[PDB]
Every structure is written in C-alpha cells, then in structure tokens.
C-alpha cells in the first residue's frame, strides 16, 4: 500500500442481557481522520490488499486491546471472488492473535445491484461453513435486502438507521419494523438496529423486541480504543 | 430522434373478478425489437425527448387500441429529469386522446441508490397531486424499495418477479411475501405481483391476499395491441 490507517471500535449493545455483543470495526486515518479520507484511495488495483489490511488490523488491534466478545468487520463490498485464497490471511491472522473464528461477523454490502445473487450468496455460505458470524449490513438502504434474504439467510440483518430515526412516533416506520421483525423471526434471522440516537428510539425498539442495537445513544466510534457505553441504557 | 419505436402492452389481470385492470406500456423497435435494443441508444443528450415521446406514444396508441382501463408507463429514471414540471407535454396528450389522467400510472424505478429521498418523493407526490396513479416498479429488486416506502406511498407497489418465482415451493419466499403484505395494508398500498410464470405461483399469490397480477402466465406483451388474457385461469 501507498498509506497507511488504523481503526476505531463501536460497541453493540444486547438491551435483553445488558451486555456487549461486540464492536463494529471502523476504518480511520492514522491521526483520525475519516474512514472516507481512506477509502477513497482504494482503486481497482488496490482493493484486494486494502482488504486484507483491514481485517489483519482490526483482529490485531481487537487482540492488543483486549476484546473478549464479537468482532465486526466490513467486508470490502465486491467481494474477494474465489473466497478460497484470500481467506487464508484472515484464518492466519485469527489464529495468530488467538481470536476465535466463530467472534468473528463479516458485514456485507453490496457493490452494484444484485442480478446474480449466486456469488455474494456463495461467499456468505462458505463464511458460514468456516464458523464466522454474518450480517446483511444495510437493510433498508443502499440495494435491497430483500433480494439477498430471498437466496440466503445471514446470522444477523442489520437495519439501517433511516428505518430507525424517530421510529417512537413515526407509524409507518413502526409497521415496517413489526413486519420486518416478524419476517426476521420467520427466517431465523437475528435483528439489530444501527444509528440509535435517542432513548425514544430505543425504548420503542426493545419494546418490539429488538435485542441487538448501535448507535451513539450508546457510544460514538473509539479511535484505536473500545468505548464503554452509556450506562443510561441499563438504567432509565 | 435519429430512432424511432414503438409500444407493446401486457395486460394487469385483476384475478378475484377476471378483469383486466389495465396494460403497462413496453418499450419496442419498429419491427418488434427488443426493448433494450431502443433504451440503449438513449443517452444524456435524449433521455428528456425519449421520455416525453415514450409518453406520447403510449397514450396515443392505447387511445387508437380502444383502452378503456388503466395505462401504466415506465418512468425513466429521474436522477436526470431532476428539473420535472415538463408534465404538461403529458396532460397535453392525455387531453388530445381523451384519455384521463386518473388513468394513467407512472411506475417509478430508482437511477441510483438513493440518499435523499425527497428528490423522488417530490415527484411522486406532484404526480398524485395531478390525478396521475403511482407504482413502486421494483419492489425486492435492485435498489432498496424499503428505503423509498419509509418516506412516501404509492397506489401499488409492484413486487418483482425474483420474490415471486416458485413461491409455492420456496418457504423463504412465503415468509417475505405474507410478512410484506401485510405491511403494504398497513401502508394503504395496492400489491401487484409481477412475472407470474405458472398456475401454481397464481394460486399460491391469490391465496396470500394478492389481486392484481402480471405474467407470461395471463399474456406475453402484445406489439401495438392489447393481448387477451389465458383462458386457463379463469377457470381451472
Ligand atoms: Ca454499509
Ligand atoms: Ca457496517
Ligand atoms: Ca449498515
Ligand atoms: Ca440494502
Ligand atoms: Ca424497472
Ligand atoms: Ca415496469
Ligand atoms: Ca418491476
Ligand atoms: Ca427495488
């Protein structure tokens, strides 16, 4: 690579145990600057490399710091194709920090719109079938989820905050959200919100039975660190 | 132009009462070439006169064919008829043929992911605020239809052939289509279910709750007719 970057962590709460399921790993600049600064020096013929440097990064730094629970990695959307030479870095990397395999969720989002779902599905199942956890990164934005989750079903589905903004007092996003909950539940399919911002928004969502949420109600991203979470969540 | 085309129309079958509840317009050569064969040779420079003489044409045609029920027109995606208002090129041809307003729907596909939905909110609600009806085009396709209906509802929402096909087998899909059904009521959105290919998708779709349907399996599009519907259907 021609540059360098680290990463920032943001926890994911379980609001049913009161505890954290894991931290989503956030790319940064070397002195913070913003996952877009180095994203977008990531070209055709760099992509490949970018890849594998972020997950080497997130399970080292997820290892120096500490982290006892999931690890949560954006996959670099189009995928790394044959998902069978280039996992070698991620299993070698996982082995040699001694961070377990199955702490480990890949989040997936799409390039391009999905004509053919065979390819991300094949990636998704082969994931799956080595014991990494894997969510669905961007339902209800972005491609449709939908399409993905009629071919295959991920450990988790994360739903987008724009689903999730003012959801308390907004009707038609409450009846998206039971319907899309009870279709989660029918595929057995692990819900959880992204872009939490206000205990309103939480309240309602843990009353409809969401477990698994983010989002800086919580905690913003920590720079090279693991952010505790507010503890108003498990007060209130 | 320096091309010229013309309509094909497919019959929208109304399955409870046997009646055809209108035609959507299809774009074709002159000799029955293919749609894509016509929209590839659209680019910047013509995609504004290609849209308003798709309009033209079949409003003309569906006048000069004698329909008396609804005429469905593809709307070109917006990312580039920003300025609209153009409209009245459309109300004029409406009025010319003697063809209402209320009649006509324009079916709205995405030209890009969608970040600000009030660029194509705005349209769609200052087409209702004409008489026009409205449809989602893709709903469990390409981009995020969720994304759209959080912030604004159409008549009918046109669910994609992907999540309809074999749904009589598929457990995955009736979960999806019995759970978004009972969100489009919620929403107060007509479903219409579109490349119904088989008996066995119709019944399985008539029994979910689902009216309006489309598919090789009533009519294959007709060029510059109005194709009648499979006899087999309505008995059976
Ligand atoms: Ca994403
Ligand atoms: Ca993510
Ligand atoms: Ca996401
Ligand atoms: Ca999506
Ligand atoms: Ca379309
Ligand atoms: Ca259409
Ligand atoms: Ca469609
Ligand atoms: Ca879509």
Not at 100 to 105: A, G
Not at 140 to 164: E, P
Not at 165 to 170: E, G, L, M, S
Request: glycine residues 6%.
């Amino acid at each position: 690579l021609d540059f360098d970057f680290t990463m920032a962590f943001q926890p994911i709460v379980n609001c049913r145990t009161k505890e954290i399921f894991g931290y989503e790993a956030l790319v940064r600049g070397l002195n913070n600057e913003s996952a877009y600064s180095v994203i977008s020096r990531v070209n055709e013929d760099n992509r490949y490399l970018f890849d594998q440097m972020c997950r080497v990064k997130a399970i080292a730094l997820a290892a120096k710091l500490g982290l006892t629970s999931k690890l949560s990695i954006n996959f670099l959307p189009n995928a790394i194709y044959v998902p069978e030479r280039c996992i070698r870095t991620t299993l070698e990397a996982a082995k040699r920090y001694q961070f377990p395999i199955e702490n480990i969720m890949f989040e997936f989002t799409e390039a391009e719109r999905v004509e053919d779902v065979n390819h991300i599905k094949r990636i998704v199942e082969y994931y799956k079938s080595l014991g990494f956890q894997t969510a669905i990164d961007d339902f209800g934005s972005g491609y449709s989820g939908l399409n993905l989750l009629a071919d295959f079903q991920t450990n988790i589905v994360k739903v987008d905050m724009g689903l999730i903004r003012n959801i308390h007092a907004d009707q038609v996003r409450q009846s998206i959200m039971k319907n899309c909950l009870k279709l989660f539940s029918d595929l057995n399919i692990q819900p959880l919100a992204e872009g939490v911002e206000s205990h309103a928004e939480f309240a309602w969502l843990k009353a409809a039975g969401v477990e698994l949420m983010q989002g800086y109600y919580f905690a913003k991203p920590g720079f090279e660190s693991l952010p505790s979470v507010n503890p108003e969540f498990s007060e209130a």
